[PDB]
């Protein structure tokens, strides 16, 4: 019971964490680089749209 | 004439109100998928009938009253009369059908789902419209309703006056089919519904020891009765006894029956869903 | 006793997470241009379910999607042509999840009945019936044609081998029932959000919860990875949607508006990851901007409560299946 | 080419016809949920009318379908929000479990469960049919002086039997007071929260009773009648 929880927290303790600035910058870079190929973000042309 | 312009203004307001209300009803039903319901198909049928009435017979009738003459052709006089009869009969029969639907929904809740379907509702609406159209167009278009006395003959031959003269037989038949049979059916339906509501309220009081039906039924029945019954009574009388009733009173009661159409959608569309749909529309 | 040690380790984890933080995503993001207003309309409105809808899953292609309802029929639709390719009657009257295999050959459904039935589209019959769960299976997803991961009413999440029909491994460590699950672009990692505020990342091969995120104040109804796979977003009965980052191991942002108090049933991301789309108990969907956290659009077409929300792999369209038995395709 | 489109349209038409038949079958059937305490006596009443237990019993040519989600010892009920189209929720409570306290009384926990069901944001239009099991055993307990409700329930000390209460053809005043006190304890929770959309129907049932099917049929009929009346603003 409690031993399993203690072991799980001990295992979760030793995890390397990168600074939030770097992670935010990586998410920013992905969103900026892959923004061109997004029909939702940029209104797709009517001819290009399969639905309409 | 100040008297004439006032009548023109009041009829213009009446036709505008009828058209606006009914168009709003059809638009609200058609726009939203939540509103489309088996009973709402009958509501749409009633709204369409009243809208056709307001578009066709109210403006032409007002023009006939104000100008005191019929500028258009005799065939258009007959067509206008047929359209008016069709609209009135369809509207009243649709009210009767709505009452019957409520009766079958309350009295037999278990079998109500199977009793009424979309296809069956469409069949019922088509049958109502077919019988109304027959009763209106066929006797009028085939000239069975035309009277025999010289007073009607001169009016029918003349191309300037569009007045209604009818036999003692067609008047009775049309009045019966349009109003009296629907009146009896609706009275019996709403008596049964009131008894069921009273029984349910009595049971609820028997339990949970720690009115509303009367007001709603009073609206639904009394408005329709006070709007249509006098006109049909004088419709029967004018062939039963010609001398008593006057033409002006006859037309006045007919116009009360007309404004019944504009009163209908304020009564039959007070549900909160219809209110939300109306708010979204406007 | 052991509770003191557990509290000490939890405090150490909290201190490490706090020291790891440098600045919020808003601090970096506020400089860039906003997404602007986003307008979407119901390109296709798909009809044919008797009862209210809970779950849909887009196929590998953007063409096909599968939906289920309590009327007992699992219907596969062709989104482009608005045609019903298949309709599968379901043994269980109540179903709460759907799954469309990456190959498209198989489709699996769960339900209140504690059985994960898998149907072979290309033969529709019950290929395998998966049993061994105490509680209702809330969500099911496909690692491949042979492997399926199911979150169930009991705290355990399980990985199954379809051919063998037995649980290859079971994931334990949650307090409440597991409601939502999402797979990474690579099939190695997956998370599961449960009734408890905690949402845990799992490792399929190891079978252990590497990280646990507990930012929420209530049950988590929806969870979904970022397309990169480094982040995921969680819905809740609270009006907040939160974006969690695996490397940072803590919450990055919360998506909430003062006016809305309804919970979030389903969440999803756009292909680029800029737009977070979240369903709501308020009969409408909201399209947040992930970086800005400022709402960019609203989808109020549905009449009843939305229950599912998926975005095509191509990124062409978004489909929301609500409780009015009506599933609508937005673009 | 167009042949594939024509074949797909034909398949769509066949599926639509099958769905229409399924809708015709589905509309007739009325769905019920039988929620109750584990020790209340659900099994006996289920056998009386007859992970999830589904039974199909028909009365007066009306198809009733009943589901009973038992087991797993669930305390936070999330499946309860799925049962939104059910006409009625059958609640089975043992009114004779007042003295038996499972570490709070079982009847008190049943009252809490009924309150949770009643005050649910999703079951705001679902009526509850309440069955109070083991009236004979309740009578056996109340006739004996070992356990009295006043000791366990403090409101019973000042409580009195309702004037309009209808006693059984053969029943003691004390058991009548006890059963009516329990029924009013449930009905006090039932009445306050509701706005008139849904009601509670309390029925006093023994294990030997076999007329429960008719009682459920009548309760469902009343529920649908009241729903239709309120829809038309008549009630
Ligand atoms: C222009 N006057 C018409 C002619 C007779 C008639 C009317 C309405 C309903 C009927 O059933 C009728 O037979 C009147 O509106």
PDB file of N, CA, C and O and ligand atoms in Angstrom, chain B residues 80-81 84-85 88-89 92 135 164 166 170-171 174-175 178-179 228 231-232 235 250 254 258, ligand 1:
ATOM      1  N   UNK B  80     -60.355  34.399 -55.612  1.00  0.00           N
ATOM      2  CA  UNK B  80     -60.185  34.976 -54.287  1.00  0.00           C
ATOM      3  C   UNK B  80     -61.136  34.323 -53.296  1.00  0.00           C
ATOM      4  O   UNK B  80     -60.740  33.996 -52.170  1.00  0.00           O
ATOM      5  N   UNK B  81     -62.391  34.126 -53.706  1.00  0.00           N
ATOM      6  CA  UNK B  81     -63.348  33.459 -52.827  1.00  0.00           C
ATOM      7  C   UNK B  81     -62.902  32.034 -52.510  1.00  0.00           C
ATOM      8  O   UNK B  81     -62.955  31.597 -51.351  1.00  0.00           O
ATOM      9  N   UNK B  84     -59.971  32.097 -50.086  1.00  0.00           N
ATOM     10  CA  UNK B  84     -60.409  32.427 -48.734  1.00  0.00           C
ATOM     11  C   UNK B  84     -61.049  31.224 -48.053  1.00  0.00           C
ATOM     12  O   UNK B  84     -60.745  30.914 -46.891  1.00  0.00           O
ATOM     13  N   UNK B  85     -61.941  30.528 -48.764  1.00  0.00           N
ATOM     14  CA  UNK B  85     -62.585  29.353 -48.180  1.00  0.00           C
ATOM     15  C   UNK B  85     -61.550  28.283 -47.861  1.00  0.00           C
ATOM     16  O   UNK B  85     -61.587  27.659 -46.791  1.00  0.00           O
ATOM     17  N   UNK B  88     -59.513  29.330 -44.693  1.00  0.00           N
ATOM     18  CA  UNK B  88     -60.280  29.227 -43.453  1.00  0.00           C
ATOM     19  C   UNK B  88     -60.466  27.766 -43.062  1.00  0.00           C
ATOM     20  O   UNK B  88     -60.228  27.374 -41.909  1.00  0.00           O
ATOM     21  N   UNK B  89     -60.894  26.937 -44.019  1.00  0.00           N
ATOM     22  CA  UNK B  89     -61.143  25.533 -43.717  1.00  0.00           C
ATOM     23  C   UNK B  89     -59.864  24.829 -43.288  1.00  0.00           C
ATOM     24  O   UNK B  89     -59.862  24.076 -42.305  1.00  0.00           O
ATOM     25  N   UNK B  92     -58.849  25.981 -39.635  1.00  0.00           N
ATOM     26  CA  UNK B  92     -59.671  25.440 -38.556  1.00  0.00           C
ATOM     27  C   UNK B  92     -59.465  23.933 -38.423  1.00  0.00           C
ATOM     28  O   UNK B  92     -59.357  23.401 -37.308  1.00  0.00           O
ATOM     29  N   UNK B 135     -63.366  21.155 -50.817  1.00  0.00           N
ATOM     30  CA  UNK B 135     -64.522  21.897 -50.320  1.00  0.00           C
ATOM     31  C   UNK B 135     -64.512  23.344 -50.799  1.00  0.00           C
ATOM     32  O   UNK B 135     -65.573  23.907 -51.097  1.00  0.00           O
ATOM     33  N   UNK B 164     -70.402  37.997 -52.201  1.00  0.00           N
ATOM     34  CA  UNK B 164     -70.649  36.587 -51.933  1.00  0.00           C
ATOM     35  C   UNK B 164     -72.143  36.344 -51.764  1.00  0.00           C
ATOM     36  O   UNK B 164     -72.773  36.910 -50.864  1.00  0.00           O
ATOM     37  N   UNK B 166     -74.691  32.778 -51.776  1.00  0.00           N
ATOM     38  CA  UNK B 166     -74.581  31.329 -51.728  1.00  0.00           C
ATOM     39  C   UNK B 166     -75.943  30.703 -51.468  1.00  0.00           C
ATOM     40  O   UNK B 166     -76.866  31.356 -50.977  1.00  0.00           O
ATOM     41  N   UNK B 170     -75.073  24.870 -49.932  1.00  0.00           N
ATOM     42  CA  UNK B 170     -73.620  24.978 -49.875  1.00  0.00           C
ATOM     43  C   UNK B 170     -73.175  25.750 -48.644  1.00  0.00           C
ATOM     44  O   UNK B 170     -72.137  25.438 -48.054  1.00  0.00           O
ATOM     45  N   UNK B 171     -73.927  26.780 -48.254  1.00  0.00           N
ATOM     46  CA  UNK B 171     -73.576  27.524 -47.050  1.00  0.00           C
ATOM     47  C   UNK B 171     -73.561  26.608 -45.836  1.00  0.00           C
ATOM     48  O   UNK B 171     -72.604  26.609 -45.053  1.00  0.00           O
ATOM     49  N   UNK B 174     -70.579  23.982 -46.177  1.00  0.00           N
ATOM     50  CA  UNK B 174     -69.276  24.596 -45.960  1.00  0.00           C
ATOM     51  C   UNK B 174     -69.096  25.013 -44.510  1.00  0.00           C
ATOM     52  O   UNK B 174     -68.031  24.787 -43.928  1.00  0.00           O
ATOM     53  N   UNK B 175     -70.123  25.616 -43.901  1.00  0.00           N
ATOM     54  CA  UNK B 175     -70.014  26.005 -42.501  1.00  0.00           C
ATOM     55  C   UNK B 175     -69.805  24.790 -41.611  1.00  0.00           C
ATOM     56  O   UNK B 175     -68.927  24.797 -40.737  1.00  0.00           O
ATOM     57  N   UNK B 178     -66.238  23.285 -42.256  1.00  0.00           N
ATOM     58  CA  UNK B 178     -65.159  24.175 -41.852  1.00  0.00           C
ATOM     59  C   UNK B 178     -65.075  24.300 -40.337  1.00  0.00           C
ATOM     60  O   UNK B 178     -63.982  24.233 -39.764  1.00  0.00           O
ATOM     61  N   UNK B 179     -66.212  24.476 -39.664  1.00  0.00           N
ATOM     62  CA  UNK B 179     -66.188  24.872 -38.261  1.00  0.00           C
ATOM     63  C   UNK B 179     -66.858  23.877 -37.329  1.00  0.00           C
ATOM     64  O   UNK B 179     -66.283  23.530 -36.291  1.00  0.00           O
ATOM     65  N   UNK B 228     -64.525  32.737 -34.383  1.00  0.00           N
ATOM     66  CA  UNK B 228     -65.155  32.108 -35.541  1.00  0.00           C
ATOM     67  C   UNK B 228     -66.651  31.855 -35.384  1.00  0.00           C
ATOM     68  O   UNK B 228     -67.389  31.979 -36.364  1.00  0.00           O
ATOM     69  N   UNK B 231     -69.410  34.374 -36.813  1.00  0.00           N
ATOM     70  CA  UNK B 231     -69.453  34.416 -38.268  1.00  0.00           C
ATOM     71  C   UNK B 231     -70.179  33.207 -38.833  1.00  0.00           C
ATOM     72  O   UNK B 231     -70.948  33.334 -39.788  1.00  0.00           O
ATOM     73  N   UNK B 232     -69.961  32.025 -38.258  1.00  0.00           N
ATOM     74  CA  UNK B 232     -70.637  30.844 -38.783  1.00  0.00           C
ATOM     75  C   UNK B 232     -72.111  30.821 -38.394  1.00  0.00           C
ATOM     76  O   UNK B 232     -72.947  30.335 -39.167  1.00  0.00           O
ATOM     77  N   UNK B 235     -73.563  33.042 -40.843  1.00  0.00           N
ATOM     78  CA  UNK B 235     -73.496  32.355 -42.128  1.00  0.00           C
ATOM     79  C   UNK B 235     -74.667  31.400 -42.298  1.00  0.00           C
ATOM     80  O   UNK B 235     -75.260  31.314 -43.379  1.00  0.00           O
ATOM     81  N   UNK B 250     -72.073  40.850 -41.618  1.00  0.00           N
ATOM     82  CA  UNK B 250     -71.496  39.615 -42.140  1.00  0.00           C
ATOM     83  C   UNK B 250     -70.010  39.790 -42.440  1.00  0.00           C
ATOM     84  O   UNK B 250     -69.179  38.966 -42.033  1.00  0.00           O
ATOM     85  N   UNK B 254     -66.720  38.147 -40.644  1.00  0.00           N
ATOM     86  CA  UNK B 254     -65.714  37.487 -41.471  1.00  0.00           C
ATOM     87  C   UNK B 254     -64.320  38.028 -41.174  1.00  0.00           C
ATOM     88  O   UNK B 254     -63.346  37.268 -41.123  1.00  0.00           O
ATOM     89  N   UNK B 258     -60.933  36.410 -39.772  1.00  0.00           N
ATOM     90  CA  UNK B 258     -59.622  36.604 -40.385  1.00  0.00           C
ATOM     91  C   UNK B 258     -58.557  36.922 -39.340  1.00  0.00           C
ATOM     92  O   UNK B 258     -57.470  36.336 -39.355  1.00  0.00           O
TER      93      UNK B 258
HETATM   94  C1  LIG E   1     -65.648  36.120 -48.555  1.00  0.00           C
HETATM   95  N1  LIG E   1     -66.530  35.371 -47.639  1.00  0.00           N
HETATM   96  C2  LIG E   1     -66.205  33.928 -47.476  1.00  0.00           C
HETATM   97  C3  LIG E   1     -67.271  33.032 -48.170  1.00  0.00           C
HETATM   98  C4  LIG E   1     -67.936  31.919 -47.304  1.00  0.00           C
HETATM   99  C5  LIG E   1     -67.045  31.254 -46.271  1.00  0.00           C
HETATM  100  C6  LIG E   1     -66.083  32.029 -45.608  1.00  0.00           C
HETATM  101  C7  LIG E   1     -65.272  31.381 -44.653  1.00  0.00           C
HETATM  102  C8  LIG E   1     -65.389  30.036 -44.356  1.00  0.00           C
HETATM  103  C9  LIG E   1     -66.335  29.217 -44.994  1.00  0.00           C
HETATM  104  O1  LIG E   1     -66.488  27.915 -44.745  1.00  0.00           O
HETATM  105  C10 LIG E   1     -67.188  29.850 -45.982  1.00  0.00           C
HETATM  106  O2  LIG E   1     -68.099  29.129 -46.615  1.00  0.00           O
HETATM  107  C11 LIG E   1     -65.962  33.545 -45.949  1.00  0.00           C
HETATM  108  O3  LIG E   1     -64.686  34.004 -45.615  1.00  0.00           O
END
